[PDB]
PDB file of all heavy atoms in Angstrom:
ATOM      1  N   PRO A1387     -39.154 -18.606 -68.769  1.00 55.24           N
ATOM      2  CA  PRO A1387     -40.103 -18.329 -69.843  1.00 55.24           C
ATOM      3  C   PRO A1387     -41.394 -19.106 -69.639  1.00 55.24           C
ATOM      4  O   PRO A1387     -41.477 -20.037 -68.846  1.00 55.24           O
ATOM      5  CB  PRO A1387     -39.370 -18.792 -71.101  1.00 55.24           C
ATOM      6  CG  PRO A1387     -38.469 -19.868 -70.613  1.00 55.24           C
ATOM      7  CD  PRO A1387     -38.046 -19.466 -69.226  1.00 55.24           C
ATOM      8  N   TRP A1388     -42.414 -18.702 -70.397  1.00 57.30           N
ATOM      9  CA  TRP A1388     -43.701 -19.377 -70.347  1.00 57.30           C
ATOM     10  C   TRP A1388     -43.555 -20.826 -70.794  1.00 57.30           C
ATOM     11  O   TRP A1388     -43.066 -21.102 -71.891  1.00 57.30           O
ATOM     12  CB  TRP A1388     -44.720 -18.628 -71.211  1.00 57.30           C
ATOM     13  CG  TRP A1388     -46.135 -19.050 -70.946  1.00 57.30           C
ATOM     14  CD1 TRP A1388     -46.819 -20.017 -71.602  1.00 57.30           C
ATOM     15  CD2 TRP A1388     -47.018 -18.530 -69.946  1.00 57.30           C
ATOM     16  NE1 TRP A1388     -48.078 -20.137 -71.086  1.00 57.30           N
ATOM     17  CE2 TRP A1388     -48.229 -19.240 -70.062  1.00 57.30           C
ATOM     18  CE3 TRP A1388     -46.912 -17.538 -68.970  1.00 57.30           C
ATOM     19  CZ2 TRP A1388     -49.328 -18.994 -69.237  1.00 57.30           C
ATOM     20  CZ3 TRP A1388     -48.003 -17.290 -68.148  1.00 57.30           C
ATOM     21  CH2 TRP A1388     -49.194 -18.018 -68.286  1.00 57.30           C
ATOM     22  N   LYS A1389     -43.977 -21.757 -69.935  1.00 56.71           N
ATOM     23  CA  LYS A1389     -43.773 -23.181 -70.177  1.00 56.71           C
ATOM     24  C   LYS A1389     -45.019 -23.898 -70.664  1.00 56.71           C
ATOM     25  O   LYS A1389     -44.904 -25.017 -71.172  1.00 56.71           O
ATOM     26  CB  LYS A1389     -43.281 -23.878 -68.904  1.00 56.71           C
ATOM     27  CG  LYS A1389     -41.974 -23.321 -68.346  1.00 56.71           C
ATOM     28  CD  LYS A1389     -40.785 -23.704 -69.201  1.00 56.71           C
ATOM     29  CE  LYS A1389     -39.488 -23.190 -68.606  1.00 56.71           C
ATOM     30  NZ  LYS A1389     -38.283 -23.806 -69.222  1.00 56.71           N
ATOM     31  N   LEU A1390     -46.193 -23.301 -70.504  1.00 56.99           N
ATOM     32  CA  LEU A1390     -47.445 -23.949 -70.880  1.00 56.99           C
ATOM     33  C   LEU A1390     -47.722 -23.722 -72.364  1.00 56.99           C
ATOM     34  O   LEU A1390     -47.829 -22.575 -72.807  1.00 56.99           O
ATOM     35  CB  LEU A1390     -48.589 -23.420 -70.017  1.00 56.99           C
ATOM     36  CG  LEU A1390     -48.303 -23.308 -68.519  1.00 56.99           C
ATOM     37  CD1 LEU A1390     -49.456 -22.633 -67.790  1.00 56.99           C
ATOM     38  CD2 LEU A1390     -48.029 -24.677 -67.942  1.00 56.99           C
ATOM     39  N   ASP A1391     -47.867 -24.807 -73.129  1.00 53.47           N
ATOM     40  CA  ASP A1391     -48.045 -24.711 -74.571  1.00 53.47           C
ATOM     41  C   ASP A1391     -49.258 -25.451 -75.120  1.00 53.47           C
ATOM     42  O   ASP A1391     -49.557 -25.297 -76.306  1.00 53.47           O
ATOM     43  CB  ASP A1391     -46.794 -25.215 -75.305  1.00 53.47           C
ATOM     44  CG  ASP A1391     -46.240 -26.492 -74.714  1.00 53.47           C
ATOM     45  OD1 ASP A1391     -46.441 -26.724 -73.505  1.00 53.47           O
ATOM     46  OD2 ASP A1391     -45.594 -27.262 -75.458  1.00 53.47           O
ATOM     47  N   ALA A1392     -49.967 -26.234 -74.306  1.00 52.82           N
ATOM     48  CA  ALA A1392     -51.148 -26.947 -74.769  1.00 52.82           C
ATOM     49  C   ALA A1392     -52.277 -25.975 -75.094  1.00 52.82           C
ATOM     50  O   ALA A1392     -52.300 -24.830 -74.642  1.00 52.82           O
ATOM     51  CB  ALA A1392     -51.620 -27.947 -73.712  1.00 52.82           C
ATOM     52  N   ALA A1393     -53.202 -26.440 -75.927  1.00 54.69           N
ATOM     53  CA  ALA A1393     -54.320 -25.622 -76.361  1.00 54.69           C
ATOM     54  C   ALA A1393     -55.563 -26.490 -76.481  1.00 54.69           C
ATOM     55  O   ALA A1393     -55.482 -27.718 -76.563  1.00 54.69           O
ATOM     56  CB  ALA A1393     -54.010 -24.921 -77.689  1.00 54.69           C
ATOM     57  N   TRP A1394     -56.720 -25.832 -76.473  1.00 53.69           N
ATOM     58  CA  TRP A1394     -57.986 -26.530 -76.648  1.00 53.69           C
ATOM     59  C   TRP A1394     -58.081 -27.125 -78.053  1.00 53.69           C
ATOM     60  O   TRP A1394     -57.640 -26.521 -79.032  1.00 53.69           O
ATOM     61  CB  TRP A1394     -59.145 -25.566 -76.392  1.00 53.69           C
ATOM     62  CG  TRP A1394     -60.503 -26.191 -76.449  1.00 53.69           C
ATOM     63  CD1 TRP A1394     -60.890 -27.365 -75.880  1.00 53.69           C
ATOM     64  CD2 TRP A1394     -61.654 -25.670 -77.123  1.00 53.69           C
ATOM     65  NE1 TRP A1394     -62.214 -27.609 -76.153  1.00 53.69           N
ATOM     66  CE2 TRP A1394     -62.704 -26.583 -76.917  1.00 53.69           C
ATOM     67  CE3 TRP A1394     -61.900 -24.521 -77.878  1.00 53.69           C
ATOM     68  CZ2 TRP A1394     -63.982 -26.386 -77.440  1.00 53.69           C
ATOM     69  CZ3 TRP A1394     -63.170 -24.329 -78.398  1.00 53.69           C
ATOM     70  CH2 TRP A1394     -64.194 -25.250 -78.177  1.00 53.69           C
ATOM     71  N   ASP A1395     -58.637 -28.336 -78.143  1.00 52.13           N
ATOM     72  CA  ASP A1395     -58.788 -29.017 -79.425  1.00 52.13           C
ATOM     73  C   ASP A1395     -60.032 -28.588 -80.198  1.00 52.13           C
ATOM     74  O   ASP A1395     -60.231 -29.054 -81.323  1.00 52.13           O
ATOM     75  CB  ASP A1395     -58.820 -30.541 -79.217  1.00 52.13           C
ATOM     76  CG  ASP A1395     -59.995 -30.996 -78.364  1.00 52.13           C
ATOM     77  OD1 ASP A1395     -60.715 -30.136 -77.826  1.00 52.13           O
ATOM     78  OD2 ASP A1395     -60.198 -32.218 -78.228  1.00 52.13           O
ATOM     79  N   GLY A1396     -60.863 -27.714 -79.636  1.00 56.13           N
ATOM     80  CA  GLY A1396     -62.081 -27.268 -80.278  1.00 56.13           C
ATOM     81  C   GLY A1396     -63.237 -28.245 -80.256  1.00 56.13           C
ATOM     82  O   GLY A1396     -64.290 -27.931 -80.827  1.00 56.13           O
ATOM     83  N   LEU A1397     -63.101 -29.399 -79.592  1.00 57.19           N
ATOM     84  CA  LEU A1397     -64.132 -30.432 -79.617  1.00 57.19           C
ATOM     85  C   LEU A1397     -64.449 -31.002 -78.238  1.00 57.19           C
ATOM     86  O   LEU A1397     -65.616 -31.118 -77.862  1.00 57.19           O
ATOM     87  CB  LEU A1397     -63.717 -31.585 -80.535  1.00 57.19           C
ATOM     88  CG  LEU A1397     -64.049 -31.547 -82.027  1.00 57.19           C
ATOM     89  CD1 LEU A1397     -63.505 -32.806 -82.693  1.00 57.19           C
ATOM     90  CD2 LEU A1397     -65.544 -31.411 -82.256  1.00 57.19           C
ATOM     91  N   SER A1398     -63.412 -31.386 -77.493  1.00 57.80           N
ATOM     92  CA  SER A1398     -63.605 -32.103 -76.243  1.00 57.80           C
ATOM     93  C   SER A1398     -63.882 -31.143 -75.088  1.00 57.80           C
ATOM     94  O   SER A1398     -63.572 -29.952 -75.143  1.00 57.80           O
ATOM     95  CB  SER A1398     -62.386 -32.959 -75.920  1.00 57.80           C
ATOM     96  OG  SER A1398     -61.829 -33.521 -77.094  1.00 57.80           O
ATOM     97  N   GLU A1399     -64.464 -31.693 -74.029  1.00 57.90           N
ATOM     98  CA  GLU A1399     -64.658 -30.928 -72.807  1.00 57.90           C
ATOM     99  C   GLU A1399     -63.332 -30.730 -72.085  1.00 57.90           C
ATOM    100  O   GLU A1399     -62.380 -31.497 -72.241  1.00 57.90           O
ATOM    101  CB  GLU A1399     -65.635 -31.630 -71.871  1.00 57.90           C
ATOM    102  CG  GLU A1399     -67.050 -31.713 -72.358  1.00 57.90           C
ATOM    103  CD  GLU A1399     -67.942 -32.370 -71.333  1.00 57.90           C
ATOM    104  OE1 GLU A1399     -67.505 -33.351 -70.708  1.00 57.90           O
ATOM    105  OE2 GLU A1399     -69.082 -31.910 -71.148  1.00 57.90           O
ATOM    106  N   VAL A1400     -63.284 -29.671 -71.287  1.00 60.41           N
ATOM    107  CA  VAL A1400     -62.108 -29.325 -70.499  1.00 60.41           C
ATOM    108  C   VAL A1400     -62.540 -29.259 -69.041  1.00 60.41           C
ATOM    109  O   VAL A1400     -63.722 -29.426 -68.729  1.00 60.41           O
ATOM    110  CB  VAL A1400     -61.492 -27.997 -70.964  1.00 60.41           C
ATOM    111  CG1 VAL A1400     -61.176 -28.052 -72.444  1.00 60.41           C
ATOM    112  CG2 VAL A1400     -62.433 -26.846 -70.656  1.00 60.41           C
ATOM    113  N   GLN A1401     -61.591 -28.995 -68.147  1.00 63.79           N
ATOM    114  CA  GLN A1401     -61.869 -28.865 -66.723  1.00 63.79           C
ATOM    115  C   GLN A1401     -61.215 -27.606 -66.194  1.00 63.79           C
ATOM    116  O   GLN A1401     -60.019 -27.391 -66.411  1.00 63.79           O
ATOM    117  CB  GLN A1401     -61.378 -30.079 -65.945  1.00 63.79           C
ATOM    118  CG  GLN A1401     -62.398 -31.183 -65.885  1.00 63.79           C
ATOM    119  CD  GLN A1401     -62.012 -32.277 -64.945  1.00 63.79           C
ATOM    120  OE1 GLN A1401     -60.977 -32.213 -64.288  1.00 63.79           O
ATOM    121  NE2 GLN A1401     -62.848 -33.302 -64.868  1.00 63.79           N
ATOM    122  N   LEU A1402     -62.001 -26.762 -65.528  1.00 63.30           N
ATOM    123  CA  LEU A1402     -61.475 -25.593 -64.822  1.00 63.30           C
ATOM    124  C   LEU A1402     -61.058 -26.037 -63.427  1.00 63.30           C
ATOM    125  O   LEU A1402     -61.904 -26.421 -62.612  1.00 63.30           O
ATOM    126  CB  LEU A1402     -62.518 -24.478 -64.747  1.00 63.30           C
ATOM    127  CG  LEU A1402     -62.196 -23.377 -63.728  1.00 63.30           C
ATOM    128  CD1 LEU A1402     -60.964 -22.584 -64.136  1.00 63.30           C
ATOM    129  CD2 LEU A1402     -63.373 -22.446 -63.483  1.00 63.30           C
ATOM    130  N   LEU A1403     -59.750 -26.016 -63.170  1.00 62.65           N
ATOM    131  CA  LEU A1403     -59.217 -26.298 -61.839  1.00 62.65           C
ATOM    132  C   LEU A1403     -59.319 -25.016 -61.017  1.00 62.65           C
ATOM    133  O   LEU A1403     -58.350 -24.289 -60.805  1.00 62.65           O
ATOM    134  CB  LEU A1403     -57.781 -26.808 -61.931  1.00 62.65           C
ATOM    135  CG  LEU A1403     -57.289 -27.825 -60.887  1.00 62.65           C
ATOM    136  CD1 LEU A1403     -55.860 -28.291 -61.173  1.00 62.65           C
ATOM    137  CD2 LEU A1403     -57.396 -27.278 -59.473  1.00 62.65           C
ATOM    138  N   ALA A1404     -60.537 -24.740 -60.552  1.00 60.45           N
ATOM    139  CA  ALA A1404     -60.810 -23.523 -59.800  1.00 60.45           C
ATOM    140  C   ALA A1404     -60.291 -23.632 -58.374  1.00 60.45           C
ATOM    141  O   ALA A1404     -60.548 -24.623 -57.686  1.00 60.45           O
ATOM    142  CB  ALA A1404     -62.308 -23.235 -59.783  1.00 60.45           C
ATOM    143  N   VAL A1405     -59.556 -22.619 -57.928  1.00 58.12           N
ATOM    144  CA  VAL A1405     -59.116 -22.551 -56.538  1.00 58.12           C
ATOM    145  C   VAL A1405     -59.694 -21.276 -55.933  1.00 58.12           C
ATOM    146  O   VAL A1405     -59.010 -20.249 -55.868  1.00 58.12           O
ATOM    147  CB  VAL A1405     -57.584 -22.598 -56.419  1.00 58.12           C
ATOM    148  CG1 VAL A1405     -57.180 -22.626 -54.970  1.00 58.12           C
ATOM    149  CG2 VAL A1405     -57.044 -23.814 -57.124  1.00 58.12           C
ATOM    150  N   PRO A1406     -60.951 -21.290 -55.497  1.00 60.50           N
ATOM    151  CA  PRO A1406     -61.559 -20.076 -54.968  1.00 60.50           C
ATOM    152  C   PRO A1406     -61.020 -19.756 -53.593  1.00 60.50           C
ATOM    153  O   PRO A1406     -60.507 -20.644 -52.893  1.00 60.50           O
ATOM    154  CB  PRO A1406     -63.058 -20.421 -54.920  1.00 60.50           C
ATOM    155  CG  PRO A1406     -63.209 -21.687 -55.690  1.00 60.50           C
ATOM    156  CD  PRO A1406     -61.909 -22.398 -55.562  1.00 60.50           C
ATOM    157  N   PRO A1407     -61.129 -18.502 -53.163  1.00 64.61           N
ATOM    158  CA  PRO A1407     -60.656 -18.137 -51.824  1.00 64.61           C
ATOM    159  C   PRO A1407     -61.458 -18.858 -50.752  1.00 64.61           C
ATOM    160  O   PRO A1407     -62.690 -18.813 -50.742  1.00 64.61           O
ATOM    161  CB  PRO A1407     -60.885 -16.620 -51.777  1.00 64.61           C
ATOM    162  CG  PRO A1407     -60.916 -16.199 -53.184  1.00 64.61           C
ATOM    163  CD  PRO A1407     -61.556 -17.326 -53.935  1.00 64.61           C
ATOM    164  N   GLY A1408     -60.739 -19.542 -49.855  1.00 68.83           N
ATOM    165  CA  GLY A1408     -61.328 -20.253 -48.743  1.00 68.83           C
ATOM    166  C   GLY A1408     -61.874 -21.627 -49.064  1.00 68.83           C
ATOM    167  O   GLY A1408     -62.428 -22.273 -48.172  1.00 68.83           O
ATOM    168  N   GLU A1409     -61.762 -22.087 -50.304  1.00 69.21           N
ATOM    169  CA  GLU A1409     -62.305 -23.366 -50.726  1.00 69.21           C
ATOM    170  C   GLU A1409     -61.212 -24.220 -51.347  1.00 69.21           C
ATOM    171  O   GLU A1409     -60.257 -23.700 -51.934  1.00 69.21           O
ATOM    172  CB  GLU A1409     -63.454 -23.176 -51.727  1.00 69.21           C
ATOM    173  CG  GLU A1409     -64.571 -22.277 -51.233  1.00 69.21           C
ATOM    174  CD  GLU A1409     -65.683 -22.089 -52.257  1.00 69.21           C
ATOM    175  OE1 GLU A1409     -65.807 -22.937 -53.161  1.00 69.21           O
ATOM    176  OE2 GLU A1409     -66.428 -21.095 -52.161  1.00 69.21           O
ATOM    177  N   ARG A1410     -61.360 -25.535 -51.230  1.00 71.48           N
ATOM    178  CA  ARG A1410     -60.371 -26.436 -51.795  1.00 71.48           C
ATOM    179  C   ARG A1410     -60.466 -26.438 -53.318  1.00 71.48           C
ATOM    180  O   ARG A1410     -61.500 -26.115 -53.906  1.00 71.48           O
ATOM    181  CB  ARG A1410     -60.532 -27.847 -51.224  1.00 71.48           C
ATOM    182  CG  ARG A1410     -61.665 -28.660 -51.822  1.00 71.48           C
ATOM    183  CD  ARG A1410     -61.923 -29.930 -51.015  1.00 71.48           C
ATOM    184  NE  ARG A1410     -60.689 -30.540 -50.548  1.00 71.48           N
ATOM    185  CZ  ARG A1410     -60.067 -31.540 -51.163  1.00 71.48           C
ATOM    186  NH1 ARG A1410     -60.571 -32.053 -52.273  1.00 71.48           N
ATOM    187  NH2 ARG A1410     -58.940 -32.024 -50.666  1.00 71.48           N
ATOM    188  N   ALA A1411     -59.350 -26.791 -53.958  1.00 74.04           N
ATOM    189  CA  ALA A1411     -59.307 -26.881 -55.412  1.00 74.04           C
ATOM    190  C   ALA A1411     -60.300 -27.921 -55.914  1.00 74.04           C
ATOM    191  O   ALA A1411     -60.364 -29.038 -55.397  1.00 74.04           O
ATOM    192  CB  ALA A1411     -57.894 -27.229 -55.879  1.00 74.04           C
ATOM    193  N   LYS A1412     -61.063 -27.550 -56.937  1.00 73.29           N
ATOM    194  CA  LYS A1412     -62.123 -28.381 -57.475  1.00 73.29           C
ATOM    195  C   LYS A1412     -62.085 -28.340 -58.992  1.00 73.29           C
ATOM    196  O   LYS A1412     -61.882 -27.278 -59.584  1.00 73.29           O
ATOM    197  CB  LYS A1412     -63.491 -27.897 -56.976  1.00 73.29           C
ATOM    198  CG  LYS A1412     -63.652 -26.389 -57.051  1.00 73.29           C
ATOM    199  CD  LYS A1412     -65.075 -25.948 -56.817  1.00 73.29           C
ATOM    200  CE  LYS A1412     -65.284 -25.481 -55.392  1.00 73.29           C
ATOM    201  NZ  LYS A1412     -66.456 -24.573 -55.291  1.00 73.29           N
ATOM    202  N   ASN A1413     -62.256 -29.499 -59.621  1.00 70.87           N
ATOM    203  CA  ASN A1413     -62.317 -29.586 -61.073  1.00 70.87           C
ATOM    204  C   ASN A1413     -63.758 -29.382 -61.527  1.00 70.87           C
ATOM    205  O   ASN A1413     -64.663 -30.098 -61.085  1.00 70.87           O
ATOM    206  CB  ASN A1413     -61.785 -30.932 -61.560  1.00 70.87           C
ATOM    207  CG  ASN A1413     -60.291 -31.059 -61.380  1.00 70.87           C
ATOM    208  OD1 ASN A1413     -59.792 -31.115 -60.259  1.00 70.87           O
ATOM    209  ND2 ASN A1413     -59.565 -31.129 -62.486  1.00 70.87           N
ATOM    210  N   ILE A1414     -63.972 -28.412 -62.403  1.00 70.16           N
ATOM    211  CA  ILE A1414     -65.298 -28.105 -62.932  1.00 70.16           C
ATOM    212  C   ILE A1414     -65.251 -28.403 -64.426  1.00 70.16           C
ATOM    213  O   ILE A1414     -64.683 -27.626 -65.204  1.00 70.16           O
ATOM    214  CB  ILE A1414     -65.707 -26.656 -62.664  1.00 70.16           C
ATOM    215  CG1 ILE A1414     -65.635 -26.345 -61.164  1.00 70.16           C
ATOM    216  CG2 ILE A1414     -67.103 -26.380 -63.207  1.00 70.16           C
ATOM    217  CD1 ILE A1414     -66.689 -27.061 -60.345  1.00 70.16           C
ATOM    218  N   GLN A1415     -65.849 -29.520 -64.832  1.00 73.73           N
ATOM    219  CA  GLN A1415     -65.819 -29.915 -66.230  1.00 73.73           C
ATOM    220  C   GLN A1415     -66.837 -29.115 -67.038  1.00 73.73           C
ATOM    221  O   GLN A1415     -67.913 -28.783 -66.548  1.00 73.73           O
ATOM    222  CB  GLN A1415     -66.102 -31.408 -66.357  1.00 73.73           C
ATOM    223  CG  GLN A1415     -65.738 -31.987 -67.695  1.00 73.73           C
ATOM    224  CD  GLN A1415     -65.638 -33.488 -67.650  1.00 73.73           C
ATOM    225  OE1 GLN A1415     -65.361 -34.068 -66.602  1.00 73.73           O
ATOM    226  NE2 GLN A1415     -65.872 -34.134 -68.789  1.00 73.73           N
ATOM    227  N   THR A1416     -66.482 -28.800 -68.280  1.00 73.39           N
ATOM    228  CA  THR A1416     -67.356 -27.992 -69.122  1.00 73.39           C
ATOM    229  C   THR A1416     -66.924 -28.120 -70.574  1.00 73.39           C
ATOM    230  O   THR A1416     -65.794 -28.509 -70.878  1.00 73.39           O
ATOM    231  CB  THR A1416     -67.346 -26.527 -68.678  1.00 73.39           C
ATOM    232  OG1 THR A1416     -68.385 -25.810 -69.347  1.00 73.39           O
ATOM    233  CG2 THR A1416     -66.004 -25.883 -68.975  1.00 73.39           C
ATOM    234  N   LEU A1417     -67.845 -27.805 -71.476  1.00 72.70           N
ATOM    235  CA  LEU A1417     -67.488 -27.710 -72.882  1.00 72.70           C
ATOM    236  C   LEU A1417     -67.306 -26.250 -73.241  1.00 72.70           C
ATOM    237  O   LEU A1417     -68.268 -25.474 -73.125  1.00 72.70           O
ATOM    238  CB  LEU A1417     -68.543 -28.353 -73.773  1.00 72.70           C
ATOM    239  CG  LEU A1417     -68.240 -28.204 -75.266  1.00 72.70           C
ATOM    240  CD1 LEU A1417     -67.095 -29.089 -75.698  1.00 72.70           C
ATOM    241  CD2 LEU A1417     -69.470 -28.506 -76.064  1.00 72.70           C
ATOM    242  N   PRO A1418     -66.120 -25.828 -73.653  1.00 68.90           N
ATOM    243  CA  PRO A1418     -65.894 -24.402 -73.910  1.00 68.90           C
ATOM    244  C   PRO A1418     -66.672 -23.900 -75.119  1.00 68.90           C
ATOM    245  O   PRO A1418     -66.942 -24.635 -76.074  1.00 68.90           O
ATOM    246  CB  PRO A1418     -64.382 -24.321 -74.164  1.00 68.90           C
ATOM    247  CG  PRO A1418     -63.826 -25.603 -73.640  1.00 68.90           C
ATOM    248  CD  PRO A1418     -64.891 -26.622 -73.800  1.00 68.90           C
ATOM    249  N   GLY A1419     -67.038 -22.619 -75.051  1.00 67.00           N
ATOM    250  CA  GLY A1419     -67.592 -21.919 -76.188  1.00 67.00           C
ATOM    251  C   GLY A1419     -66.471 -21.388 -77.053  1.00 67.00           C
ATOM    252  O   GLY A1419     -65.331 -21.848 -76.983  1.00 67.00           O
ATOM    253  N   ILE A1420     -66.788 -20.386 -77.869  1.00 65.05           N
ATOM    254  CA  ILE A1420     -65.835 -19.842 -78.828  1.00 65.05           C
ATOM    255  C   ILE A1420     -65.844 -18.324 -78.773  1.00 65.05           C
ATOM    256  O   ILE A1420     -66.904 -17.697 -78.856  1.00 65.05           O
ATOM    257  CB  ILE A1420     -66.123 -20.326 -80.263  1.00 65.05           C
ATOM    258  CG1 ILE A1420     -65.787 -21.801 -80.378  1.00 65.05           C
ATOM    259  CG2 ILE A1420     -65.285 -19.550 -81.257  1.00 65.05           C
ATOM    260  CD1 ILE A1420     -64.335 -22.053 -80.647  1.00 65.05           C
TER     261      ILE A1420
END
């Protein structure tokens, strides 16, 4: 079953752990919109 249960707090910045094709995994920090 789906094991991921965390959610955005609506305030703090998050990080996109982007794994693009041909590139190493990189954390891209950002403040999410709504």
Side-chain angles (χ1 to χ4, degrees):
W1388 194 268
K1389 301 288 182 166
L1390 315 174
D1391 44 333
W1394 184 45
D1395 62 353
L1397 272 179
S1398 323
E1399 293 182 320
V1400 305
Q1401 272 189 2
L1402 165 67
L1403 212 177
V1405 184
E1409 305 179 21
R1410 78 191 321 263
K1412 44 169 99 158
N1413 290 67
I1414 304 291
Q1415 196 163 334
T1416 191
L1417 177 72
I1420 290 276

